[model samples]
Target chain A: QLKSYYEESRGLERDLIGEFVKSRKTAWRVATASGLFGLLGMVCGIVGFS
Target chain B: EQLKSYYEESRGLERDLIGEFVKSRKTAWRVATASGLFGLLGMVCGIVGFS
Candidate 1:
């Protein structure tokens, strides 16, 4: 029973790490998109470029 | 049976961790999306000569 438990725990740990890695990528992408949009808005307002 | 109990408790803790991780991730995505929308709206205002 303990062996099976250890195996399952390892699997859960693997999943946890995978989720964190994937979410990190997603979060960075989302932040970058927001930052670029903000910069675009700032330039547009300043230059009146439309 | 003793090992089984330990396993159950560990599983419970893992589930809790996963739940919190997912909840936090959801909040981040929502905030990011809202921020992007606000920025886009600002750009529109600028284009319309309101900014």
Candidate 2:
């Protein structure tokens, strides 16, 4: 039973690390997309005014 | 029998990843929403200046 890696950590470390990495990646994507959209909106507004 | 064993093992791995990934994604989405909202507010303010 102790020989199993899953049994050693109760699989919690793997779960937490996986969770952290996944969340971090998602956050990066969200920030990037938001920044892009903000730039697009600004450009459109400027063009409209000009 | 071998096929059944492989299927079970694959499902176990999938369940583990899915559970962890989903929970993390939920937390990420909340953070992303907060950040995006602030960013949108700033952009709107900047646009107002231009307008």
Candidate 3:
């Protein structure tokens, strides 16, 4: 059986980066996930950078 | 003390984001690579058909 589209999309975008070309929604998926993590890192940095 | 604590925390967090950014960039890079591949395919197709 097929996986839900979100999980399906999530896995392949990570799993299939070089295997095939990514689409617009794929870019958003990767970007959004990474961006949130990055923002968390940055905010923590700002909160207490020397 | 707070700065030192934060800086130490920042050290790891910032270090970790590098991987996150790499993930984001992979999406972008793959798109670029994929499009480039298509260009090559099109070129070959054109060469096969054109004067």
Candidate 4:
């Protein structure tokens, strides 16, 4: 029973992550991509857009 | 449904902003700026990505 308890909670954590990614997937894609490219744009601007 | 509400709101604004991106070049800035807080949840999701 003790081992079973641990296994159940581990399964639970996976479900939580599943639910989160199932929703708001697009929001994340934008945030991460924008953070990368957004920072890159600043680099180009400093380079004079040449 | 609060998250759903926020997504719908953000997506609609994003559409408008993209259209204006070339016209003003300000929209891109606005996207990276205006949605700063909205993206906070997304940031959290990013951390969750590892799990």
Error of 4 at B33 (Å): 9.1
lDDT tens string, model 1, A1-50? 55798788877777666777698678768877877877777777778753
Could you tell me the fnat of model 3?
Answer: 0.01
Candidate number that wins on TM-score, 1 or 4: 1
TM-score of chain A of 4: 0.42
Predictions' DockQ, in order: 0.28, 0.19, 0.02, 0.02
TM-score of each: 0.59, 0.44, 0.34, 0.28
Pull out the clashing pairs in model 1.
none
User: What shift in Å separates residue A43 of candidate 1 from its native position after superposition?
Assistant: 2.2
Best by DockQ: 1
TM-score of 1: 0.59
Lowest lDDT sum, 10 consecutive residues, model 2 chain B, at B42-51
The DockQ-derived docking category for candidate 1 is acceptable
* lDDT of each residue in B1-51, candidate 4, tens digit only: 587877878988978865654434444444645455454544555444433
Report the error of model 3 at residue A1, Å: 42
- In model 1, what lDDT does residue B23 have? 84
Q: For residue B35, give model 1's deviation from the true position in Å.
A: 1.4
Quality of candidate 2 docking, DockQ: 0.19
Runs in model 1 deviating more than 4 A are: A1-20, B1-9
| Model 2 lDDT tens row, B1-51 | 587977878888989987877776777777788768877975786677566
